[PDB]
Curated annotation (Swiss-Prot), chains A, B:
Native species: Bos taurus (Bovine)
Assembly notes: Interacts with and forms tight 1:1 complexes with RNH1. Dimerization of two such complexes may occur. Interaction with RNH1 inhibits this protein. Monomer.
Residues reported in the UniProt entry to bind substrate: 7, 10, 41-45, 66, 85
Protein name: Ribonuclease pancreatic
EC number(s) recorded for this UniProt protein: 4.6.1.18
Tissue: Pancreas.
Function: Endonuclease that catalyzes the cleavage of RNA on the 3' side of pyrimidine nucleotides. Acts on single-stranded and double-stranded RNA.
Disulfide bonds: 26-84, 40-95, 58-110, 65-72
Amino acid sequence: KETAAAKFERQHMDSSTSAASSSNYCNQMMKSRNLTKDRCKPVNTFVHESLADVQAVCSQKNVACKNGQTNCYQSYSTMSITDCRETGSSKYPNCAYKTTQANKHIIVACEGNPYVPVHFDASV
Amino acid sequence: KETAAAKFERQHMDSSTSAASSSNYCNQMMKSRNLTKDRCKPVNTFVHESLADVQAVCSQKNVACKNGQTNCYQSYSTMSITDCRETGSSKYPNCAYKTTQANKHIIVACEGNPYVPVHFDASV
């Protein structure tokens, strides 16, 4: 039974390399992470920093979450990210995404012991 | 000097077939990849996925290695593989193998900068 922490890592961490290198990064990554398996997940962000650096966000700027909870944290620094968004013509089972690389702060919800990210709330 | 990363590709990649389909695959491959030179390597697994799909596993689910180290990673999806296991009546230099094809999650050990597969740990 996947933990919320593990889910975060499967959906949002890609510490492989510092940049999405290819226009097809999202198509490959979305599939390699199980996010085109039953339906196309429409929108997803991958963060290209070390796990340690992303976990450290949980001791940075405390902010409200979109849902009203107060266990969210904004990274003090910007991070290398890739935004994956399904195209307007994408239709399961041939999921198609446009890849956009950015450097932006991330906002995560943190929970548990160890106290780690369990939800990606936004990039800013 | 063969790198560890190139050694893994020699010993464990074979992105040319979708499977095995052929009882003689391991007899041919184990020899062809230099795995029967000094002895009959007793067990070995080949992966029938792209090189980028196997290298992407080093950013996938972190799991303990069988030897207790921490640098092993399990694929989120299943991958086409072929296990090769030396038969009971195999005698070097005439190494003989049973060929079994499967679709299993793979577990690899990753090392280096760039962080790449260097050992095939297990399939599950």
